[PDB]
């Protein structure tokens, strides 16, 4: 129940604001900046500010704070969802999120803000649907918004019906400094880039553990996703009844389903780090990386970030495989590897000096994070079975999909 | 299918070697399509196995069935899930319609000795589906 959603800037200047209820004076935005400065300087800064009886909820964008003031006990979650939808719409319409576009497309920006929500109640959220009525370069509103299918525009015609899927894997590993992995969760991501003619209704079928058990085929390798969240086009009733994944695919790239379950397998990369840090004399980086993934798989663009000392200087690198570059901006050593075949073992020996003068304050021990990304690898073993592409006119579809395994929250606690 | 014929002798020898009673990961060949076996494909595979032999009358075992499913998946891209047997006790009917192979007793259901038997009526009669309507959806 936000009173007015506004777009601010890094210097406190409001790029654009649009009142929806009018219950709060527009001059309250001036006090938002001092309140944020005080909260940050005292550690009490939070996304939802509070200026007396009015709460100033704001989120940090690429360059501006999307502040949405409110007065009553409105749905904070609803405000957050509206802000996320607005951010997605801005990203779709504007390729850049900075002050260069905020002051460059205000003519269409005002119309989009007016059309998106009214009186604090969001009404339009389809970026593709909104692009059919609001353009920066007007006809009646499309019937798709009025119709039940607001995620599949009818009448779309394509020369070919090719859909590019994406089996994106997220390997999140939380290895403590004691050597044990605490948080080992893998989040699936079934994203498809559908480009076909008409309004096809995808009939998804994969190797799910629940589906195999229900059909009686619970004996092969089936993925038991702890959390499975369908997209907007996905029908909740069909999945609730018999795990029937039937929905109308959108026009373009969209996230249909996203698996989320814990992992009980060994890490794909085993990283052993050593710290022979002399007392203000030198430091040793006994970093050893063991690839626990299958030898048939290669981790392309592997970047094992090793945090070096804050005041460290004059580093010397004695490694075996992979380029090592010390970036002073990040204050860490990135064990950069172009391609890392599975089962590889790379040994590195860092050595640098330290200033004689001791530091006045501690710097902390940031965790070691790697940026491995091995495509065409399915650690979870979930295999897609079929995708029921049905059209009223009738056409032969040629769906495509690629499985990509990358490194997510794969942080390693430092000693 | 020359590749299937070539792999049939080695697969049969491996199945015979395994008694009736190391690497991690899930590598996938690039660009190879993966889908469940079809009824016509299952019928053709059953006919080929019957003609070449080594499948009818062989003692049913988990390891041999897994090896056969893996060989079929490698040679054709068919998921090793259509080669399922109906729940016991007694004769186990194929899970996928069109399959010409079934497991029958040769003498707890796990302790019963099963043998693969050819069945042409399986490709035309859904005995397993009739027995377990819930499993077929």
């Amino acid at each position: 129940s936000a009173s007015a959603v506004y777009v601010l800037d890094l210097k406190g200047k409001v790029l654009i604001c649009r009142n929806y209820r009018g219950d709060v004076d527009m001059s309250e935005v001036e006090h938002f900046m001092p309140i944020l400065m005080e909260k940050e300087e005292e550690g009490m800064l939070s996304p939802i500010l509070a200026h007396g009886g009015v709460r100033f909820m704001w989120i940090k964008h690429n360059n501006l704070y999307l502040v949405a003031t409110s007065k009553k006990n409105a749905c904070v979650s609803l405000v957050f969802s509206f802000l996320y939808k607005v951010v997605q719409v801005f990203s779709e319409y504007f390729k850049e999120l900075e002050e260069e576009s905020i002051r460059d497309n205000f003519v269409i920006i005002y119309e989009l803000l007016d059309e998106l929500m009214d009186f604090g109640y969001p009404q339009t959220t389809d970026s593709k649907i909104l692009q059919e009525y609001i353009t920066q370069e007007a006809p009646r509103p499309p019937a798709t918004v009025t119709n039940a299918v607001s995620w599949r525009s009818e009448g779309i015609k394509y020369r070919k019906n090719e859909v590019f899927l994406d089996v994106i894997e997220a390997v999140n590993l939380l290895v403590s400094a004691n050597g044990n992995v605490l948080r080992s969760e893998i989040v699936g991501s079934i994203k498809m880039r559908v480009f076909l003619s008409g309004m096809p209704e995808l009939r998804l079928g994969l190797n799910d553990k629940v589906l195999f058990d229900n059909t009686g085929r619970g004996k092969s390798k089936s993925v038991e996703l702890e959390d499975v969240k369908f997209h907007q086009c996905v029908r909740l009733s069909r999945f609730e009844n018999d795990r029937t994944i039937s929905f109308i695919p959108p026009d373009g790239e969209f996230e249909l389903m996203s698996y989320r379950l814990n992992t009980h397998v060994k890490p794909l990369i085993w990283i052993e780090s050593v710290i022979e840090k002399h007392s203000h004399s030198r430091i040793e980086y006994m970093v050893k990386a063991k690839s626990q993934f299958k030898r048939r798989s290669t981790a392309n663009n592997v970047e094992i970030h090793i945090p070096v000392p804050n005041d460290a200087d004059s580093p010397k690198f004695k490694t075996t495989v992979g380029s090592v570059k010390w970036v002073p901006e990040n204050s860490e050593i990135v064990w950069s590897v172009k391609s890392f075949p599975g089962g590889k073992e790379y040994l590195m020996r860092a050595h640098f000096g330290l200033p004689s003068v001791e530091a006045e304050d501690k710097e902390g021990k940031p965790p070691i994070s790697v940026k491995f990304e091995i495509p065409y690898f399915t650690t979870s073993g979930i295999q897609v079975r079929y995708l029921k592409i049905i059209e009223k006119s009738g056409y032969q579809a040629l769906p495509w999909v690629r499985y990509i395994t990358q490194n997510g929250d794969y942080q390693l606690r430092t000693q | 299918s020359k590749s299937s014929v070539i792999g049939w002798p080695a697969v049969r020898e491996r199945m015979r070697r395994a008694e009736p009673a190391e690497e991690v990961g899930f590598p996938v060949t690039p660009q190879v399509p993966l889908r469940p076996m079809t009824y016509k494909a299952a019928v053709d595979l059953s006919h080929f196995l019957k003609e070449k032999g080594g499948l009818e009358g062989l003692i049913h075992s988990q390891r041999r069935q897994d090896i056969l499913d893996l060989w079929i998946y490698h040679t054709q891209g068919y998921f090793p899930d259509w080669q399922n047997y109906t729940p016991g006790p007694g004769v186990r009917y194929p899970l996928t319609f069109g399959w010409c192979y079934k497991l029958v007793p040769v003498e707890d259901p796990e302790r019963e000795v099963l043998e693969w038997r050819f069945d042409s009526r399986l490709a035309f009669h859904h005995v397993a589906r009739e027995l377990h309507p819930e499993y077929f959806k």
Binding site: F164, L165, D166, V167, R203, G205, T215, R217, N300, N301, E373, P375, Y376, F377, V384, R385, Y386, L387, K388, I389, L398, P399, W400, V401, R402, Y403, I404, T405, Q406 | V28, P30, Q31, V32, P33, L34, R35, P36, M37, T38, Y39, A41, A42, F79, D81, W82, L95, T96, F97, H126, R129, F136, K137
Partner: peptide, 18 residues
């Protein structure tokens, strides 16, 4: 080609489940 795993053809449904 393309980094992240080459695109592969997909089926229409579980042919083995009828």
């Amino acid at each position: 080609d393309r980094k992240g795993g080459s695109y592969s053809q997909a089926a229409g449904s579980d042919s083995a489940q009828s």
